[PDB]
Design a protein around this ligand. Structure first.
Ligand SMILES: Nc1ncnc2c1ncn2[C@@H]1O[C@H](COP(=O)(O)OP(=O)(O)OP(=O)(O)O)[C@@H](O)[C@H]1O
Ligand SMILES: Nc1ncnc2c1ncn2[C@@H]1O[C@H](COP(=O)(O)OP(=O)(O)OP(=O)(O)O)[C@@H](O)[C@H]1O
Ligand SMILES: Nc1ncnc2c1ncn2[C@@H]1O[C@H](COP(=O)(O)OP(=O)(O)OP(=O)(O)O)[C@@H](O)[C@H]1O
Ligand SMILES: Nc1ncnc2c1ncn2[C@@H]1O[C@H](COP(=O)(O)OP(=O)(O)OP(=O)(O)O)[C@@H](O)[C@H]1O
Ligand SMILES: Nc1ncnc2c1ncn2[C@@H]1O[C@H](COP(=O)(O)OP(=O)(O)O)[C@@H](O)[C@H]1O
Ligand SMILES: [Mg+2]
Ligand SMILES: [Mg+2]
Ligand SMILES: [Mg+2]
Ligand SMILES: [Mg+2]
Lengths: 379, 329, 379, 379, 274
């Protein structure tokens, strides 16, 4: 009858192409559900699936004139929407999906059932997600240095591990984490390690969403933070000075609900999924316009204490009261972070921490017995 | 005469395509009227209706270059506009239409008569719209926990009843409902339950209104995070876009007098650690242990059809003769 | 079986075309990776590679109707992304790549391995990169006039050399360098020499990035400093006047991060790589909103002392305390800089300085004692 | 092998089409490098060069469909970018290039070497560029009435000559000139004479470039003054009033740098070559925010003294100290300026002045002693 | 020659498509001059006029690729613009034009002559514009209740009648009218009755009634301003533009009485006293 239509029928039989409720056409090639709303990746798939059809159905796909007709057919046989990103406890890599509860790796058809559109962005090398390795040893030493495992720093350490490991599951976190710490303490190093670990599922935005009207006009910062598991926020200046705007109370509640509102540029989708762990890398005590019970149950704070300095300024940091330990700075560490030498080691550590506090359920608990004004509000 | 034109005339004979006064062409496929003013959904229909024309008129529709000629023809015959969404006592699902006065579910050609261009977005599973089911029991318990049926809170429960059941009719209401209450009282829980129930007929906007292009033919609009009297009057009018939705405001403090209704939340949910800190507070009348796993089984839509049946029974209790909302000064 | 497809397969074999994570299709023509998001530069490569295939596959390549079919076929085979600009110690010219650790010049296939998308913009002439030449002698005299090799000007000269030579490596710099100095001193001369030396890998922006929230709406100034290796910021108004806004302290923290957030116009990429050395051509001592140890470890200051003047006002400059030496102005010097007379000589000087302080590892230290308020804050 | 490709190769052999670093395909037709970055002017070339190819390659180019194939090919052989507007002592007319150092006119191939993208906009009539003509006599009378050749008005006349003549050279001038003078004195007359003389290479902007932040958002006033050789700025209001903001000094400092920073509408290029002589048609004494040494060496001023008035108000002008000689208003003069009666006469006068002060090296010197506050800052 | 050219010539012969000075291509289908410079409606007319041409010229209009050719020919054949809404005393209904000088109703080609772009929004039922109707009795009673016909309220009711009748003709009014009155009096009811009466042409270009230096910027021919401006509230150059009526205490019938009121004081000319 029509060969260019039977080809589309066969391609639709394998369920490689799907249409989501957002209007996009997610496509499954190279063991990853991919989407991009300026280029029809479907015409890629037609070529990639070419070596799966009968011989006479494959020699006709080597022509862009006959590979946009089949795309036109396929685009008119996708009438029903399919919901995506349902399973929260999955980590999607550019070549499969890893199950967190048991630490096994899926590939091919086994990874297709869990429709995870957003991926980490890098392949999952099997012979690096190991327990014993020199990189793992030095990473563990570095993490011990950043957060010492002492008795009075045990609750803080466990909260640090909980917050870091929470940036792996796609559930809607109900709390925001503050990263208060003084100069040269380890906040940015932890951020870079996390970014090299989880990859594409990690975005850092500005402080506009923290304190501004996140409703007027286009705001791509909210638009990019859709299905992103980890969100970081720098730009936390002191609010004790004149002219500095306080952190808006309603923004915290707006960022903690399971479907945030925000329109990108040249579009009208104002619904964005909220899988993000929102971490606010600050340097001073933050303040809010008003304090109420609607905020003391949404703030979690972890304190970084150990400091890294050169020997010249070593003696100037020993007497500081906000400082609990002065370690030696490593000038070459930041070089071997962007080189991704501690990528899979940190991934293994994060998975081990995840299957230690979030196995039954996931929930981040607030802890306001760490903010002075919140302490005043708590009698 | 002309095959590609007889095909278009036959497709227009079935009345599967109609032109709305808003300038958008509505499409009838999979037992639901859909529209999208950014794509020629019409070219979808011309393929689906392929199994309704004779064999010689069907093999010619497997060709995208020949499925835009007939689409152009169809677009050039739709001159007379036809009104849409005129029945207010109907609820459209992705696979049919449910009547509210009777509770009977219409599907197929019977669903085509009511031109409902909007829909909830999910298929109406038949063996879930039942009265007795464990999910219904636990949902009913949750609703009682949020709003107990005490002698003092009977009028408040009745007003909450009317307001929630009002999120089913396609007419224009004339009153704005507030959700004043303290923290951990169930406002967001009620919003999420209603999202699981009614689905797509649901939008939440910012505080600027107190965006507008999205509140067209929707049946429920909300605005949370409340930290203009003329806007209340501008919203309760039947042309803002058809204002067929009810407006609910999720606030925490105390925020024309004949257009505002307020329903209060008294129950407080807390962990055992902070239980004692809420017993002595006057803002709550009862404190119950917080359910950590309840939020998880909402996005799963475990209590979707249970709340839908509750809403239908709830509607056929106050709005059967007419629909109207009375302000509480 | 298909000539238009075999041509694309052969082109893909040579790895002349690659796809970057930024959605860009970089192209290898004339010993340089070129890219233009507004022009399918691929069709240039598709033509220029025409003298590499068999004769039957070459005469078919002289047709624009069959040269967009090959680019259509190629655009559906680039499914994976390739990371670009990873090697930090390389300098890309429009006809090759120069290795900094040895001074060797690489071209052809040896230049293809280091994927350096951004290049200087000019060819590398071999018979100019020499130590003995009149241009080199007069440039050395010029530089010794700008920064004399005295004993009190020894540390400043070394810091000046380090800062100037750092604008060759693609690493990230965590230190901002100011160019404080009085009028007619030679800041703009150094800027122009640097621009003539490195070419495209050099931009100058406004002072908004220093004192403004670079998040609100589009900000092309942040958007253009992507993979640039040197960024100058002139227009430093005196902040002692009323209504002048002080330098935003957190912008300094942002500019030293490995990746910055800023959106361009008519696009939606908020991730900009930061290879830039930020130099602030100022005329007065800068002030900030707040001073903290998180700022004093990011700032280094060089001093320009020698003054250039006409003989009419020479006596009025001898008694000034802001100049340690008065030299005779050269009217024609500003002419033979835009003529690129001192281009390869300054490039040789920069390379010679680079293989003197940045060979083991690159790092720019701060000099907090050179600022009055900073000097107050240590004690 | 392919006629449509050999035609493009032959066209590229004559170097009639070039690719600029700004992304524009400059075209060489009618002895003028023309470009327009909204319509591909190349096609005009493809037709105009039609009478230079063999006959078999000529009658074919009469079809618009063919000329899109040749243009599509030519767009694909231009990889090497070219620099433009390098020679400063050349004046480009719509039909050639005039050499300023000899007063000799070039047209044709010898005019192609100096790649000058911007032209005056009118043909150069050879039989008007003469010493003796009635128009020359009346223009000389007009100019001697505007600036009399007295002994006390000799330096001012020379500075007026130098400032006017500097609007012919393509180098970057480093000084700002004012046209201070009272009412009905001859400032707009000089502006209109200059506009009729140099034509396109002359723009007039507002005071935004002088007293405003030319960095926030789009600002076309800085995008039009790219490669323009003269920029007039009238409407300098009295700053003695309330709310009137002073002239920004850093604006002056940026207006005299080789490339100025400013973005246009619907584009992203920020750098524009500053070949402009900046003249401010002021009416009152200007004041700035802060006064320093960096502002002394960028400010020059000429004073207009002769007053033109009707005989009715002639008596009221004799006793005024702001005027040194009262002439009679010529009502018909303004009419015979927009008719370009004194176009080539003033062009010859400007060239004669150019070969009197700018032959060895072109430089604009300041006059800081002609302003009261500046004189106060002077010692 | 060309069939596709003679078709365009015939279509322009009937004067169905016209070009306006605003850059629009008004088109004539369903007995209404409907225009929209966002949707090229012209193609529809090429099909609509399809059953008016010879069959040889009509059987080639069943092709979209040969109906953008006729549209192209027509589009570059309309060189001279036309002006619209030149007859103030007309009322455009979706099925014709109602003359206001006498009250006769027109439809079709004779309705095509009046180039009115903005219609009332509803069709004109022929067997409702009658004097005797129970709904007309009810509306008359409602009007009497709102504005009693007393002697002390005769000037007030006369000015009320004139102000209401002004919102029927398309000329340029030059007097603002006030509705100063207390709550629960019937001003909003009057507005609703007026909106049901005249429909689309009551809401600000080509509109005939508006509800609410400005008093001068709202009383000049071009802002075109065809609307009587009335504000629903609770220098010598200013007194000559303000008229006040005080409030103290059924669509086609309302149109009928409006027409009768109009043909009582504005038959020679229209002008509203302050
Ligand atoms: N375990 C470690 N051992 C040695 N050096 C370390 C270790 N962890 C981090 N460092 C180094 O110590 C320095 C700490 O800088 P870091 O970016 O963590 O500070 P910060 O808290 O972000 O500072 P700022 O307040 O200025 O933002 C870096 O150079 C980092 O590479
Ligand atoms: N019937 C119930 N029984 C037990 N727990 C419940 C019940 N209803 C709700 N909860 C729990 O109580 C929690 C309180 O959150 P809730 O949705 O009431 O917040 P909210 O009113 O929006 O808060 P805020 O005022 O701080 O913005 C819910 O998240 C849910 O887990
Ligand atoms: N070594 C040198 N020998 C002679 N002349 C020099 C030398 N170095 C610079 N000059 C000249 O001295 C002047 C220095 O001014 P320059 O243009 O470099 O700006 P600057 O000193 O930063 O000015 P300002 O601070 O006032 O903006 C220029 O005219 C330059 O040509
Ligand atoms: N040499 C001359 N002889 C006679 N009349 C002249 C001569 N030069 C100029 N004029 C005339 O004198 C008048 C002066 O007008 P002009 O444009 O010079 O004023 P202006 O300085 O721009 O004005 P203002 O400062 O009042 O705004 C004009 O009518 C001009 O034509
Ligand atoms: N004369 C009347 N006839 C019928 N209904 C009336 C009359 N006067 C007032 N009403 C009723 O009063 C209600 C409110 O009147 P309203 O329009 O608010 O008065 P006002 O114009 O002073 O605001 C209306 O719904 C209307 O039905
Ligand atoms: Mg940091
Ligand atoms: Mg809430
Ligand atoms: Mg300078
Ligand atoms: Mg003037």
């Amino acid at each position: 009858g029509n060969k260019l239509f039977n080809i589309a029928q066969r391609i639709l039989d394998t369920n490689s192409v799907l249409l989501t409720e957002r209007g996009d056409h997610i496509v499954w090639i190279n063991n990853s559900w991919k989407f991009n709303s300026e280029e029809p990746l479907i015409t890629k798939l037609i070529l990639s699936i070419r070596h799966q059809l009968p011989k006479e159905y494959s020699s006709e796909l080597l022509c862009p004139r006959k590979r946009k007709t089949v795309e036109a057919n396929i685009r008119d046989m996708l009438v029903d929407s399919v919901e995506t990103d349902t399973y929260p406890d999955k980590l999607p890599f550019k070549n499969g999906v890893l199950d967190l509860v048991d630490g096994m790796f899926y590939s091919g058809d086994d990874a297709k059932k869990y429709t995870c559109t957003v991926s980490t962005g890098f392949k999952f090398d099997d012979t690096k997600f190991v327990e014993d390795s020199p990189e793992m040893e030095e990473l563990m030493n570095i993490i011990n240095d950043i957060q010492p495992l002492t008795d009075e720093n045990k609750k803080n350490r466990e909260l640090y591990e909980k917050t870091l490991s929470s940036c792996l599951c796609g559930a809607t976190k109900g709390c925001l984490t503050f990263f208060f710490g003084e100069t040269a303490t380890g906040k940015s190093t932890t951020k870079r390690l996390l970014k090299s670990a989880i990859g594409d599922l990690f975005v850092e935005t500005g402080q506009t969403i923290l304190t501004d009207v996140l409703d007027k006009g286009p705001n791509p910062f909210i638009a990019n933070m859709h299905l992103k598991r980890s969100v970081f926020c720098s730009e936390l200046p002191d609010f004790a000075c004149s002219g500095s705007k306080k952190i808006r109370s309603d923004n915290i509640k707006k960022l903690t609900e399971p479907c945030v509102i925000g329109r990108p540029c040249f579009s009208n989708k104002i619904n964005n999924r909220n899988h993000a762990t929102i971490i606010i890398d600050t340097n001073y005590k933050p303040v809010f316009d008003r304090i109420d019970n609607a905020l003391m149950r949404r703030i979690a704070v972890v304190r970084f204490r150990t400091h890294f300095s050169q020997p010249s300024g070593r003696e100037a940091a020993e007497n500081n009261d906000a400082y609990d330990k002065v370690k030696l700075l490593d000038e070459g560490l930041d070089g071997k972070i962007q080189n991704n030498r501690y990528r899979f080691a940190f991934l293994y550590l994060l998975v081990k921490w995840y299957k230690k506090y979030h196995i039954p359920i996931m929930k981040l608990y607030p802890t306001p017995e760490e903010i002075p004004d919140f302490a005043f509000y708590l009698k």
